[PDB]
């Protein structure tokens, strides 16, 4: 299933979803230390159920 780049993790949130404003990416000039998140990218691991 195609990868995606919006804020949609089932793990990390809403802790690091205020570095990122919304809807995709790090807002211009956002102060970020090591470890924190920029662009929200997320991949399917199969399992395809029905």
């Amino acid at each position: 299933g195609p990868e995606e780049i919006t804020a949609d993790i089932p793990n990390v949130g809403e802790a690091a979803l205020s570095k990122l404003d919304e809807s995709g990416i790090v807002y211009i000039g956002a102060e970020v230390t090591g470890g924190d998140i920029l662009v929200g990218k997320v991949t399917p691991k199969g399992e395809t159920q029905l």
């Binding site: 195609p2 990868e3 780049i5 995709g24 990416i25 790090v26 920029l38 662009v39």
Partner: peptide
């Protein structure tokens, strides 16, 4: 490859 972004 769907999308790519480039932050500087």
């Amino acid at each position: 490859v769907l999308k790519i972004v480039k932050v500087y």
